[PDB]
Symmetry: D2
Subunit: 398 residues, 4 copies
């Protein structure tokens, strides 16, 4: 029965914020409102909480009670005014963009983006009259120059794959402020616990709660956090009309549960990541590592200004090419070969031989897809087991 | 374990189709794959699993096993090639159209659509360059007229609101074929058990499984059934990139549980509605009555040519206007005042005083929504009980 | 919403009994209180609760809200004052007996009992000083004869395997009524829909809701209904201290869900049974058939005065004994080979070759089980599909 | 690694043991087998199963595949041979005691036992011919002086409320292997991460997974781990026949989720309670503190021997008695007033005013309840937030 008072700690808010059992029969854990619609005592009441002149419910695709908790709790974590829960990370971004953008508008994106966010942009909204421009969100000079009066939205992820490149959120925020552009940042990798873009200036944050937020890989979910005005626009339009990405109260309840241990889990993802990154840094097979924890990381100072810890994500270039990458991934025994991250279990991936095994060294390299770059999502397993696993894979990657 | 499709009876396929317990450890009820990621044995299996070389999964937003069973089964019930499961009715509607339509194309709409479907059409894709035109899909003379070399898809619901107005599905299917347009019908009200648009000529059918299909109002879900080529494209583009309206295995399984009693539940709905319609008709308080089961139904004959049964939705207009309606609704004890339909629970709504209450007799007239229009979604309760509520509520309407 | 008071019809009460959305934020379907503990606003309240002075909760093992509804509902349907939900049918049986019996007490039992109920009495509570005596409850002169001052309770099922042998509930209650014994009936096969033993005189009724109540075979649950006085003891003694067979509210919800279509499902189970039982009757390969629906049924008159419908379970004997039954069973394609009943899916089982393959012709025989007796739990599939599966199988049983 | 092959650490087994996705369609999170019955391909196979000659399932009450992994995992965590899941903690102890005891047998019990298990023993099995006697399990001489040829089981909690009194598990275990008797340790409080009785000589461990194991108070479950032999006996007798406390695969899947973060949460719980215990040790209002972490704790050494960490429970007495206990309790703002423990939410309780508020000081003392003893279950919230709550409450107690 806290979170919402003066200023309870992060971990106290990710557990209590927004809920007092005294308001729900005393149920310690909040009841799950797994219902599609709600009823009214009078046609007059219905009308009231239909026109917004009243606080109530009537249909879950619009707003649900258990969903309103996750949302309220998530907003408090990112330090925003309000949040909206959705069916998936793509439901969050597509819902945001579909209502913020219109034909003739221009949107500036980071030089790199999450595959489906790229496809959506260049083959989805991008083919419905909206303008796209990929700029270096770390290059403020270039950002300012790329700005036009048609610029409505600035969208990027920080950090961004594959080299965990970082952006200057507070600087971008400033430019967009002068020009009147809305800043949207994908904060799946850090979570509200490791980085809070809204405080650095960004206007809205989108998450793929499917990853770190759920932390157990058993639900697909997305989240949006920003001003009431903005989230309200996105709730009444993007999600309801243009997208139907409605989140199941059950999954929302599952999300809210995985969040009750967000700080602990993140603490552990980073810890295992730090020692693994440094262990990777002494092997002659690894010729380059992309991890914010190492001081040799190009944007070390910028990373440590925005991020609380270097995150539990690392990537490196195996000296040996695509063949070594294949051998390295085929030899892994604890690290699972799959796509995704933020799971308790350790995941690893070699895009050059997996998601891009079709292309050519010439084309894959064109997309900035290194030939021997493998990426791992360090889980909550015992480092010893982890170090041992990649240790043998390396001996096999040769 | 018999669902040979087309051959085994409906009820038989609604329970077994697509599943043999022998293939899943003898599990009578299929295991729910509440997972987000799927891992590979090697990076070469992942590659083939990405280059369409190998059959398998890797991420539940693209495709999930539990959803695949739900999908295959729905397909069988509609006599369709392939199905697609989504987070809600609007996830299917928007996911379908977002991929079939582009800027410059035109789409012919049925006079009346679902509130949100109208909003998405007119304030969604519409504001992105797609041309819209409403045409009485029952008038084939006008349809043929309205056709153009640019009309890409014909979209409508049958029956439709606010009077259960039907369309000539095979009629427009023939026209759409000559010109080369895609007919997609919203078969929500009927369910594949009362009508199979695909067999009448339609190309795609979208469903709001939130209603009759789930039948118990505890989940929100949508469904798209059509040709393998059409559905594959909608999966790989509409859902994957532009909507992300992913359905949660937990809900998809609840839906498959509801479907298992589709026929039984739809029979009671139709049986109960008929009796109420009969009654409402002879009522002095009733000015007009819209129930496809009455021999006076304008389109009685057409209805029985497309619908195996009259469905369980009924609409009627009170002579006293908004006043009567407000009093009628407020006096209801067994019927619930709310939106939606298709629950074991009987739902009743009065637009002029609820959803469209913020209006005035202005458009309420322009939209065909009489001040006395009342829509009833007859549940499965005891008809004796439902009649006393309507009867009692009728007397209070005075 | 219509409560009980026994006025609203069975179908109304089995859907709305004891629930008013208005009292729960207007949620059509009750929110599921999936929580282990409930908090107190003050220490006083918590106390007043523990002292019954105040009504509320504290621990979901003694009393949970979600389960409470289910319990108020099942009592209504059964026509008793109180109900109680447990982890399983056995958890209900054992909990009831574990609290009504003590060393020296005597239990008069029906001749044939469900496997685990038998093993429970003879190898469970039986090895703790409780005397067990099997009697033919259809014979009142025999029962009254076995009646002794130490007889504390009378337990039986009606109908009971292997040939749905019936009992005279009202007559038994009379004998028990005069001596002071407690009558408890396992009403699993009939459900409150087809038979209400409480209305005939029984003191307590038990159910394996893992069957017809759920009707969808995805949960195992138990139910007990009877007076407030008796049930309270079972909850606060049998459930709480012994067995501790607590039901998950998730499962309780799934159960109230399947119950919403109880009458519809039972109506079909029986219609399919009658036809199937009449088709087997005309078969020369079948020697004897046990179905309360056939006019030849031995207790056909007693059956029709206690049950509103013959039910959905069938047992019959093949002329070719063992081998005919094995070949038949091993040939079935739509019916499944499995224990259990009350599922939407049709199940079949041949003791002589499955559960009792262990025994010998003599053993089984001298144990009640013929060599060619097979039991079918007719499902909701299409009758012609079911009939053609038994037909094909009968021919393969040559 | 990826289980318990390459002698994986605890955190690694807590999330990987017993499961390899490459065996279940590559699913990262194992599919939930929410099914009651399992079918067979031939009657023969079914016979095999029923007998035990063929590996498989046929009914979940006996054994379910999702529960098998929960069981197998726990077995690894506790370092045991086999495990079993039950509907609840009580379901675990009763199911266990009901199968290892018969009239004429004697069971030696620790001096203090959990409220319900005491009632169970003294008003359940106890009234069924079983002889029970309490002996201080920290006093090996008295324990041995109590061993009789009739002694069959030694059952104790360690630590045990209300003062966290310990017992020499290796000690009583050695006395047992000598005088027969089976050792059953209720290891709920410490979990297999903080204490492993099996590795000290215990025969079985019962768990109220409803607490720390679950971790989030949304489940009620129990766990038993020990030798295949003893465990196989409890499965096929206590579970199956005398208890029926079946676990829902839903909750068993949920519980396996919480276990995925056991080490992490357990660490915070302990690090949190220490600080809190230290702080309580310096306040004028506190008369006595029972925390195994305080160097002043009577069994400090022995605790340090068996428990890897001091745990998360803290009991203490207020010089002010009940009055001081009520005001301090009623004054709590972050801690919640409720029974139970092991949740991410901090809970507190004062027996003298809640559960025993009705008894007189005499009665209370004649049971083991102090007039000013309050028990605190320290959650995972923020320590600074927790200190502040207790601080003001302590002040409110004047």
């Amino acid at each position: 029965m806290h979170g919402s008072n003066k200023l309870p700690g992060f971990a106290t808010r990710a557990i209590h914020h927004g809920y007092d059992p005294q308001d729900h029969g005393g149920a310690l854990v909040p009841p799950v409102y797994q219902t599609a619609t709600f009823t009214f005592p009078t046609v007059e009441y219905g009308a009231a909480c239909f026109a917004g002149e009243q606080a109530g419910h009537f249909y879950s695709r619009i707003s649900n009670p258990t969903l309103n908790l996750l949302e309220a709790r998530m907003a408090s974590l990112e330090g925003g005014e309000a949040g909206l829960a959705l069916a998936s990370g793509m439901g969050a971004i597509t819902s945001t963009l579909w209502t913020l953008l219109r034909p003739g508008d221009e949107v500036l994106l980071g030089n790199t983006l999450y595959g489906c966010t790229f496809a959506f942009l260049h083959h989805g909204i991008g083919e419905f009259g909206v303008k796209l421009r990929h700029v270096d969100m770390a290059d403020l000079q270039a950002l300012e120059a790329a700005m036009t009066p048609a610029t409505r939205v600035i969208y990027f992820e920080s950090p961004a794959n594959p080299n965990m490149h970082m952006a200057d959120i507070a600087g971008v925020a400033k430019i967009a402020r002068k020009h009147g552009a809305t800043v949207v940042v994908d904060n799946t990798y850090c979570t509200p616990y490791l980085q809070r873009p809204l405080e650095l200036g960004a206007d809205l944050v989108v998450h793929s709660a499917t990853k770190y937020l759920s932390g157990h890989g058993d639900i697909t979910a997305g989240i949006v956090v920003g001003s009431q005005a903005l989230v309200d626009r996105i709730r009444l339009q993007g999600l309801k009309d243009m997208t139907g990405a409605v989140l199941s109260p059950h999954d929302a309840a599952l999300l809210m549960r995985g969040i009750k241990t967000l700080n602990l889990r993140m603490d552990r993802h980073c810890a295992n990541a730090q020692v693994l990154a440094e262990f990777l840094a002494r092997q002659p097979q690894v010729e380059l590592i992309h991890y914010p924890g190492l001081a040799s990381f190009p944007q070390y100072t910028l990373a440590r200004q925005q991020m609380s810890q270097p995150g539990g994500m690392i990537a490196f270039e195996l000296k040996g090419g695509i063949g070594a990458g294949r051998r390295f991934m085929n030899a892994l025994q604890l690290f699972s070969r799959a796509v995704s991250l933020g799971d308790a279990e350790s995941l690893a991936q070699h895009p050059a031989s997996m998601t891009h095994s079709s292309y050519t060294p010439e084309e894959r390299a064109h997309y900035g897809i290194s030939e021997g770059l493998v990426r791992l999502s360090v889980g909550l397993e015992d480092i010893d087991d982890l170090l041992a696993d990649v240790q043998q894979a390396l001996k096999a990657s040769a």
